[PDB]
């Protein structure tokens, strides 16, 4: 009808607002009878500093741990008895906390949110016990080894360097957890002005401001003092390591090359580029007909057991690229695939795919916009990073503006002659040297 | 393999009485020079067929070494020859015409 762009306009308009702190409250008022009530708990995975290690993960384990205004089982009473939703999704600089609710219920959890906002307590009982549930639950709770895979891509292939810094921090710290980390560094960290007032569902933004004043008001008012540095650019690790395992039965392999992060204007087409990249699913069938030529040969050659373009994020940089799975063989040709495909990419552009992955980002484009919570958090990081929202026709504009000249060129601009991430898991011998694999980082195809 | 085709396919019938194939009792389809298309073409061949062409082929080798041929009676029945692959083959002709097609696309 009014076409995908005039559908994009025909897709209704979200709105946003700024509460008086300078407080941020944005609204998507919908027909959602329930709603995702984001009280968007903005404490993320990377937001923290060196000796601050773990305090946000602890805080996560501390997030629902119980409080004063609502005790723990009481939080479970208003909340759980309400049958409501809470999450904590922690990211570089920010995070969120959902509330699924009757839009009717809209005030209640807002109230809850506020004490969440405030009354979260460090209880020398809990701090002994729930923090024996933190000391324990956390302490051994670590070991996720796809987080030694995908967060080998994050906790390894993303380095831990002050900017590369990992999430969970030390087990030494796990011993060393402090109220100074919580008594202090919760307060010494948690700072409302950055917190996000996040509105998703059927809703009244006027009422939003209202209840804001009612409960949510009086938050960032106490804020600032010291310690707010910026990101001094540097190099992330730039390496590889095999956790050297005969015990790794089959490679969970991977790779990535810049993934989104918050900032850069480029990633737009890089998105599209990553589209051209694409993720070759093991469970996916149809390899004979597979689109990613890589994927194709991978079928024909039976050339690997997985690859999935995976975008690793930091404002202006990252790595977006394939997971992978393979036996004693693939990796070599894989890069011959991958980098070569990249090489192929860096050269070979044909508008066809450009349009294809354009439609990819279109469908997908829904699938983020489409969905209540995806739209929700989408707002959350949308202003968090952006402070704006790429409108349907704005994102469909630079999107609409998509240019395959910038594919060849801009491709060369970001992509060419670099050393992004590659991490297998397991007996990596097919990993050539940086003097080979990253000699493969260079192209003698020309 | 009959008179026009016993002159012409009677390069395969009377003149493969001369050029041997059908009087050797060969399989028409089997005469296609092996190619990739031919290759996977056969890969898709029918089973009972596969046996058939097998016995044919081997035998051909057999008299070949023997440098003999079957009874001219035993020499193959003219015309009267299923085009074995040609449905399957020609199908593949469309196939590689298809891989070839969207390929062109």
């Amino acid at each position: 009808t009014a076409t995908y762009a005039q559908a994009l306009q025909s897709v209704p308009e979200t709105q946003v607002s700024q509460l008086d702190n300078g407080l941020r409250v944005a609204s998507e008022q919908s027909s959602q009878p329930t709603c995702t009530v984001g009280v968007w708990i903005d404490a993320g995975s990377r937001y923290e500093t060196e000796k601050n290690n773990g305090a946000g993960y602890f805080v996560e384990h501390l997030a629902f741990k119980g409080t004063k205004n609502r005790p723990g089982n009481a939080l479970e009473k208003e909340v759980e008895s309400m049958g409501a939703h809470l999450n904590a999704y922690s990211t570089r600089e920010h995070t969120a906390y959902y509330i699924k609710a009757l839009s009717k219920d809209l005030p209640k959890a807002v109230e809850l949110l506020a004490d969440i906002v405030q009354n979260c307590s460090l209880e020398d009982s809990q701090i002994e016990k729930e923090r024996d549930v933190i000391l324990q639950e956390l302490q051994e709770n670590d070991t996720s080894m796809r987080d030694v895979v995908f967060n080998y891509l994050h906790a390894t292939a993303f380095q831990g360097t002050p900017l590369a810094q990992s999430v969970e921090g030390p087990s030494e710290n796990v011993r060393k957890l402090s109220r100074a980390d919580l008594t202090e560094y919760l307060s010494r960290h948690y700072k409302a002005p950055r917190m996000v007032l996040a509105a998703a569902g059927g809703l009244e933004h006027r009422q939003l401001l209202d209840l804001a004043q009612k409960h949510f008001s009086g938050l960032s008012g106490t804020y600032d003092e010291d310690a707010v540095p910026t990101l001094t650019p540097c190099r992330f690790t730039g390496s590889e390591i095999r956790h050297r395992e005969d015990g790794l039965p089959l490679a969970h392999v991977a790779i990535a090359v810049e993934g989104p992060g918050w900032a850069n204007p480029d990633n737009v087409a890089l998105q599209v580029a990553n589209a051209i990249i694409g993720h070759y699913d093991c469970t996916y069938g149809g390899g004979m007909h597979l689109s990613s030529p890589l994927a194709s040969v991978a079928v024909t050659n039976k050339l690997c057991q997985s690859f999935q373009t995976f975008n690793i994020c930091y404002a202006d940089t990252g790595l977006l690229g394939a997971h992978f799975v393979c036996d004693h063989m693939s990796i070599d040709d894989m890069m011959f695939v991958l980098q070569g495909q990249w090489m192929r990419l860096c050269t070979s552009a044909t508008e066809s795919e450009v349009v294809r992955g354009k439609n990819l980002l279109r469908n997908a484009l829904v699938s983020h916009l489409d969905g209540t919570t995806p739209v929700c958090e989408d707002i959350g990081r949308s202003l968090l990073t952006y402070g704006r929202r790429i409108p349907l026709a704005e994102w469909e504009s630079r999107i609409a503006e998509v240019d395959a000249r910038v594919v060849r060129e801009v491709c060369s601009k970001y992509f060419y002659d670099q050393c992004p991430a590659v991490a297998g898991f397991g007996p990596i011998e097919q990993l050539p040297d940086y003097n080979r694999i990253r000699s493969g980082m260079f192209w003698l195809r020309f | 393999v009959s008179a026009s085709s016993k002159w012409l396919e009677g390069i395969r019938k009377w003149y493969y009485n001369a050029a041997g194939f059908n009087k050797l009792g060969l399989m028409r389809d089997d005469t296609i020079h092996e190619n990739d298309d031919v290759k996977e073409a056969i890969r898709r061949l029918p089973e009972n067929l596969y046996d058939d062409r097998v016995f044919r082929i081997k035998r051909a080798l057999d008299l070949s070494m023997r440098q003999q041929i079957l009874p001219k009676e035993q020499w193959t029945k003219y015309e009267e020859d299923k085009f074995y692959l040609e449905p399957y083959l020609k199908e593949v002709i469309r196939e590689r015409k298809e891989r070839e097609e969207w390929a062109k696309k």
Binding site: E137, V148, G247, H252, T283, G286, S367, W395 | -
Partner: protein, 57 residues
């Protein structure tokens, strides 16, 4: 007036080639995540999961 779906955490598979497979079907079973030593794996003869495509306006 004809109904198939929703009770959260059982299995009635959903799979494709373009996509991957899964079954989230009616009934529970998802509650197990609690304990300490929360561990979790990767790297040996396995499958994993979780993909999707979602973007923007």
């Amino acid at each position: 007036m004809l109904s198939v779906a929703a009770r959260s955490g059982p299995f009635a598979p959903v799979l494709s080639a373009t996509s991957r497979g899964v079954a989230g079907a009616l009934r529970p079973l998802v509650q197990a995540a609690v304990p300490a030593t929360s561990e979790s794996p990767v790297l040996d003869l396995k499958r994993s999961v979780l993909c999707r495509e979602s973007l923007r306006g």
